[PDB]
C-alpha cells in the first residue's frame, strides 16, 4: 500500500572524484520521507498495471526467488510507437528498443511479445525476503539513465529504512517518448514505486570518496538552515532562515479573443511586388499568427529574427506589426540587416541598429525572370547622402556630382536609377528574390496580433502562475482601483516591478502581488542535544505556517510553535526578543519565558538613621582584553591566476588595485 | 553580528546594578522634589513624566514589529514603504529589552541614588538621609558642609526651579533630541535606497527577469541574468559595509554612555567637564528612544 | 575560488584548452573581476576588524597606565569596589588584569 | 512676436501606468 | 499665450517614411498661432494617485533644478550643496 | 526543427553537410525521402518519431478516405534540373563531451 | 582611469568612433562598472579613515 | 579540490593515480635601506631551513 | 625573451631609463610599486616561483 521513502535512493551526480567535502547540487531526486506505492503478490492475482512515468522513477524490489525480471517502457504501449524492453532471461541481460505488439499479461515461463518490427536499438550482455534491489530511471535529452544498488535485508513485509547510494550502469541512446511503464514478473515478492522531483541536496563524501550522508534542503526549516550554512552541525541559538514561501497552484492564461487566421497568403503570395527603392509597408492587425500552415507549401531561403528567439514566437503577442515588401537580387539579400553597407543599405532601404523583428527572403526565379529579360525592377545608385532608417526616396531627378540642376543630355549629368536585368539562365547571384521584413514591439503596449495559445479561466486570491499577452509570472491577483487610460496596458512600481495589468478579455484592472512574505526564525539547542527545533513566525497572529505541530502560542515577538510556556522567570541563554527568552529544560524540551531583570530589593528612606559598614573583605576580579590579531599578506598573482602566463598577461593592467590591497594589509 | 552587538550595547549601558529597588511612596526628601523623574502609581504608563516628553519628541517608523499579509494586501492604493521592504526580503527585528524594562532599570537607578547615594555601586546599598548625602557632595568639591546646612531652603528651591525649567524646555518643539532622530532617519533611508536600486538593469535588456525569460533564449538569457545578479549582489554588499561602519560609531557612543553612567550616576567625578559645566554634584538617567538622557 | 562568476567554468585550464583566443579572453575577465572583488571584500572586513582591535588596545593601554602604575579614583574603571592594586598577566593575543 | 513657453508642452513618454512616483527621463522636450 | 501647465496625450503614430524639413499651416479665408522647437533634454515628472502628470522639473534650467534632479525630490532643505562642475 | 530533428540549446559538437545531387537525384525524380509535417506537439531534443498514423486536427482517430483526416508524411521530390534550394544534402551531426 | 576593464579600449572616443551602436553599448558598460567600483572603493577607504 | 582545482588524474597508459601540485610556494620579503644608500638588499625566505 | 619592462620618459618624450622586472627581487619590488626609488624598510614581494 502506502509507505515512506526514509532517506532512500541517492545516486552519484557526476563522474568526478571527491573526498572529505560537502557538495551542494540541484537535480532530480527522490525527496526524503515521500510517499511510495507498494505492490504485493497477495494471491494468484498478478499485480502489474500500467504505472505512469512522471520524469523519472525510483523502483525497489524485495525478493527471495527472483520474481521481477525487467521492465517495458513506452507511450502508447500497443503497436504504434517505439518501446524498450529491459529484461534478464536468466542467462543474459537484453535491452531491445523496437516497435512490437505487447501482451496484456506479459510474463516468463518468454511470453513478453507477439512479434516485432522496425528495430532501433539492441544490446546483449555477457553470459552467466532476503534481497533488496534498487533502481533509478530517468529520461533526459534522448538518453535513459539507469542507476543500480543492492542491499541484503531480512524484513518480510515493508520497505526497510536506511541509506544506500546507487551507481550508474547504463546510459542508453533511445530517443523514445516515455510516459508509461510496466514490470515483468515470473509465473512471495513485492515492489515499490516512487517519483522524482527537482530538488537541492547536500551530500557528504568520505576519505575514500564515498557518499554516506545527505541533507534534503526542502524537508523542514532545520534542513534549510543546514544547507544555508553548509554544515551538518548547528550550534545552540536562534537563526534567521529564509522568509515564508508558498508554491503556485493554478495556471492562468489570458489572451485577446481573435478569430481570423492571419493573412499569410495575401502577403507572401501576391502577383506584384514593388522595386526596392519604392518598397511598400502594410499594417497587420487583429489576427492569429501560428505560421504552421506554411509548412505544406511555402519555403524560405533565409529567415532571421532580431530581438527574440524564434522558438518563443508561438508564446507571445505582438503590438504594432508592419510588413515591408520588395524585390532584390541574390547578392543583395545579405544587405538587409542592421549595421550593413552597400547600395541597398545606403540608398534604398536601411534598418535601425536596434531593430526588433524578422527578415524573410525566398527565390522567385520562376515568376519574375523571363528568357527575354525582365527589366521592370529598379534600384537607386546615386544620391547626395545616406538614408535614415525606414525612410523612402521616390523622386527621379537628374543627378550631378557638383550638386546643381542639369539636363540629362549633357556632361556630368546622370539618371539615378538602374534596372535589374533578370534572366532565366544567369547564376543564382543574379536571380530575383522576394523580401518581407516584419517589425513589431513586445510587452509594453496593447496588442492585437497573438499566437495560437489557448486561454484559461481567471483565479482570484490565490498564488498562481499567470500569462497575460506573453508576460509570464507568479503571484496573487486581486481586483484593483487604478484607472488606466485607453493607451495603457501595464503598470509598474518604483522598482520597475509589473504590479498592475488590464485583463484583455474583460477590460478590468488587476493588481499583482508576490506570494512570499514574512520573516522566519529557527530556535535550536545544540545538535548533540536534540533534532527538535522551535519556529518563530513574525507577521502572523495565533494560518501562514509550515506546520502546526504542538504548543502554538502568541508572544510579543510573534507566533511561536514547538515550545512550552512556563510562568516562572529566569535568566536566559537564547534571547528570542521583545522580552521573551528560551531555554532547554526538563524528558527534556524547549521552554519559553519572560526574562528576569534582577533581584527584588527594598531599602527604606529615613531622615535620621544611617547605615555604616563594620567589616570588610578583599576581592580579586579578572578582566580579559584583546590587544592584537594575526598579521596577514596576500599575493594577487597566485590567487587570481595560479601558474598561468596568459592570465597573468591579462591581469597585468590591474596592478593599481593590487598595490592598493597590499598597502592596506601592510 | 551587528544585531547581537545592538543587544549588548543596551545591556552594558542600562543593566549595571544587580538588584531592583522599589520606588518610595514619598517623593519629597528634605526639600527636594523627585516627582517629575520617578514613576507615579496613578498614571497608566510605567514611566516618569519627563520620559513621556522624551518619547513624544522623537517620531518612530515601526510602531510594532508585526505587519500581516492581509494588511499589506488590504493596503495597495497607499504605497506603504514597509510593505515594499517586506515584499523584497528586508526585515527589522525587535529589540530584546522592552521599553518598560528600560524604564524599570532607570527607576531603580534613580531610587537607589535618592535613598542610598553612591554606595550601591561599590557593593550593598547603605541608607543615608538626603541632606547628609548633599553635605558629602558639597564637601567633595571643596566647600564646607555648613554652607549646605545653613542654606538648605535656597538650594532646594533652586533644584526645584531647575527641574521645572528642564520640564518646560522639553514641551516646546525643538531639536534637542535631534541626534536620536538621525539614527532612525539613516536606517529608513538605507532600506528605501535598497528598494529603489532594484530598477537598474546594470547594462542588460531589462531589469525584469520575467521580460528576459519570456522573450530571450536560454543561453542568451543566462548571460543577461548574471549581470542583474552581480549588480544586486553588489548593492547588498554596499549596504552591509555601510551598516558595519555605522555600527562601529554607535558602539563607541554606547561605550561612552556606559562609562558616563558608571562614573557620574554611581559616583561623583573629579574630571573637568565630563558631566556638565561646573562642579559636578549628581546625575540622573532617563530613557529615550534608542538612547539615554543624563541630567 | 570555485565560483565561475557567470562563465563557462571556474578553471582557467578548461577555458584555455577548449575555447578560442578572443572568446577565451572574455571569459577570463569575468573570473578576474570576481576574484578581485573577493579580495577587496576581505580587505575591507579586515580594516573594520582592525579598527575594533585598535580601540580595545587603546583601552588596555590606558588601563595599564592608570591601574597598574597607580591608584585610580574612577568608579568601576578597575574592578567592582574601591580599587587597591592591579597585576597584569600575558595571554594569547591579549592581557588579563587582576 | 517673441513670447516665452512657461512650463508648456509636456507629454506622456510611454504607455505604462505609474502613480505616486517621480520619474526621470531623457527625450525631445520643449 | 497664457502661462500654465498642461499634459498632452498621444493620438497618432503615422507610418509615413517621409523626409520632413519644412511645414506650413492652413487657414480659413481674429486668430493666432505659436511655434516652438524641441531639444534633447532630461526631465523629472511627478505622477498623482490617479496616474496623471501634474508637475515637472527641467533639469537644465538653473542650478536649483540641477540639484532637484540630482536628489530626485521637489523639496530642498536649507543648506549648501555641491552641484555639478561648471560646463 | 519542430517535427523531425531538434538540437539542444546547450549543444556541444559539430554539424557537417554536403551536396549530393549526383547520387540522390534522378531525372525521373527520387521520391524515397520523407519528412513529417503534421504533429500535435514539438519534439524534445534528440527524440525520434517513427509512427505513420492518420492525423486529425481535433485529435480523434479517423480513416484517411474522409474529411479532416490526413497522412502526416510528405515526400521530397528530388530532380536533377531544379534549383539548389531543392537539391538533396547529406547531413552528419557529431556530439561528444570534453 | 586607464584600465579598460576587459574592453576594447579605455577611451570612449575610440569605441564610439569605430564600433557600432549595439556593440558599443556593451563595451561602454564595462568601463562604467569599473569606474563606479573605483569610486566606491575610494569612498569606503575615506569613511574608515 | 574544494576549490575546483584538478588535483588528481589517472594515467591513460598505465592505470595509476597521480597527484598534481603547484610549483610556487613560500613567502619572500626584501629588506632594503634607502635607494640613496645602496643597491644592496637582503632577502628573507620563510618556509625554508 | 618575452619579458615585462618598465620604461621612463623625459619631458622631451625620450626613453632614458628602464627596469627589467625579472632580474632580481629589488627590480620586482620596483615594478610592483611603479617607482624608481624605494624607501628604507621591509617589503613583502611575490612568492617563490
Ligand atoms: C533487469 C535488468 C538487470 C540489470 C540492469 C542488472 C545488472 C547487474 N546484475 C548484477 C549481478 C547480479 N544480478 C542478479 C539478479 C538480478 N538483479 C536485478 O536487478 C534483477 C531484476 C535480478 C533478477 C534476475 C544476480 C543473481 C547477480 C549475481 C550475484 C552474485 O554474483 O553473487 C550486477 C553486478 C555485477 C557484478 O557482480 O559485478 C549488475 C550491475 N541485472 C538485471 O537483471
Ligand atoms: C503575414 C503576417 C505575419 C504577421 C506575424 C507577426 C508576428 C509573428 C512573428 C513571426 C512570424 C513568422 C512567420 C514565418 C515563420 C516561418 C517559419 C519557417 O518556415 O522558417
Ligand atoms: C582597393 C583598395 C581598397 C583600399 C580601401 C582601404 C580601406 C577601406 C575599407 C573598406 C573599403 C571597402 C571597399 C568595398 C566596399 C563594398 C561595399 C559593398 O558593395 O558591399
Ligand atoms: C502522502 O500520503 C499521505 C497519506 O498517508 C497524504 O496525506 C499526503 O498528502 C501525501 N503527500 C502528498 C504530497 O500528496
Ligand atoms: C509524446 O510526448 C509528447 C510531448 O513531447 C506528449 O504531448 C504526448 O502525449 C506523448 N505521446 C503519448 C502517446 O502520450
Ligand atoms: C499492430 O498490432 C495490431 C494489434 O491489433 C495489429 O492489428 C496490426 O496489424 C499490427 N501492425 C502491424 C504492422 O503488424
Ligand atoms: C537469453 O537471450 C539471449 C539473447 O538472444 C539468447 O541468446 C539466450 O539464448 C537467451 N537465454 C535463454 C535461456 O533462452
Ligand atoms: C515501420 O514499419 C513499416 C511496416 O510495418 C514500414 O512500412 C516503415 O517504413 C517502417 N518505418 C521505418 C522508419 O523504418
Ligand atoms: C576507507 O577505506 C578503508 C580501506 O577499505 C577502510 O578500512 C575504511 O574503514 C574506510 N573508511 C570508512 C569511513 O569507512
Ligand atoms: C497539403 O498539400 C496537399 C497538396 O496540395 C494537400 O493535398 C493537403 O490536403 C494539404 N494538407 C493540409 C493539411 O491542408
Ligand atoms: C499562390 O496563388 C496562386 C494563384 O492565386 C496559386 O496558383 C498558387 O498555388 C499559390 N501558391 C501557394 C503556395 O499557395
Ligand atoms: C471577447 O472580447 C470582448 C472584448 O473585450 C469581450 O467583451 C467578450 O466578452 C469576449 N468574449 C467572451 C466570450 O468572453
Ligand atoms: C491577535 O488577534 C486577537 C483576536 O483575534 C487580538 O485580540 C489581538 O490583539 C491580536 N494581536 C495583535 C498583536 O494584534
Ligand atoms: C570580621 O572582622 C573580624 C575582626 O575584624 C574578623 O575576625 C572576621 O573574620 C571578619 N569577618 C569575616 C567574615 O571574615
Ligand atoms: C513638588 O512636590 C509637591 C509636594 O509637596 C507636589 O505637589 C508637586 O506636584 C511637585 N512638583 C511638581 C512639578 O510635580
Ligand atoms: C483623483 O481622482 C478622484 C476621482 O476623480 C478625484 O476626486 C481626485 O481629486 C483626484 N486626485 C487629484 C489629486 O486630483
Ligand atoms: C597500451 O595501453 C594498455 C592499456 O593501459 C597498457 O597496458 C599498455 O602497457 C600500453 N602499451 C604500452 C606499449 O605501454
Ligand atoms: C633545521 O634543520 C636542523 C638540522 O637539519 C634542525 O636541527 C633544526 O631544528 C631545523 N629548524 C627548524 C625550524 O625545524
Ligand atoms: C630636452 O630638450 C631640450 C632641448 O633640446 C634640452 O635642452 C634638454 O636638455 C632636454 N632634456 C633632457 C633631460 O635632456
Numbering used by the authors:
A (entry chain C): 31 to 139, 150 to 168, 179 to 237, 249 to 603, 619 to 662, 671 to 750
B (entry chain A): 751 to 1045
C (entry chain C): 948 to 1045
D (entry chain A): 31 to 60
E (entry chain A): 209 to 237, 249 to 306
F (entry chain B): 406 to 503
G (entry chain B): 948 to 996
H (entry chain B): 554 to 602
What does the report in the manuscript say about this coordinate set?
Among structural proteins of Sarbecoviruses, spike (S) protein is responsible for receptor binding and mediates membrane fusion between cell and virus to initiate infection. RBDs in SARS-CoV-1 spikes were observed to be in the “up” and “down” positions making the spikes exhibit open and closed conformations, respectively. We introduced these three disulfide bonds in equivalent positions in the SARS-CoV-1 S sequence generating three spike variants: S/x1 (S370C and D967C), S/x2 (G400C and V969C), and S/x3 (D414C and V969C). We determined cryo-EM structures of SARS-CoV-1 S/x1, S/x2, and S/x3 spikes and we identified various previously undetected conformations for SARS-CoV-1 S through classification procedures.
SARS-CoV-1 S/x1 spike exhibited complex dynamics; we observed spikes adopting both symmetrical and asymmetrical conformations. In SARS-CoV-1 S/x1 locked-1 protomers, a linoleic acid can be modelled in the density identified in a lipid-binding pocket within the RBD. The pocket is gated by a small helix from a neighboring protomer to allow R395 within the gating helix to form a salt bridge to the negatively charged lipid head group. Therefore, the bound lipid is interacting with RBDs of two neighboring protomers and these interactions are consistent with the proposal that they stabilize locked conformations. In the S/x1 locked-1 protomer, cryo-EM density for residues between 602 and 619 is not visible suggesting that these residues form a flexible loop. In locked-1 protomers, interdigitation interactions between Y622, F305, R620, and Y819 are formed through π–π and cation–π interactions. We have proposed that these interactions rigidify this area preventing structural transitions needed for RBD opening. A salt bridge is formed between D600 of Domain D and K836 of FPPR. Likely stabilized by the participated interactions, FPPR is ordered in locked-1 conformation consisting of two small helices connected by a disulfide between C822–C833. We identified clear densities consistent with biliverdin molecules in S/x1 locked-1, locked-2, locked-112, and locked-122 structures in a NTD pocket equivalent to the previously identified biliverdin-binding pocket in SARS-CoV-2 S.
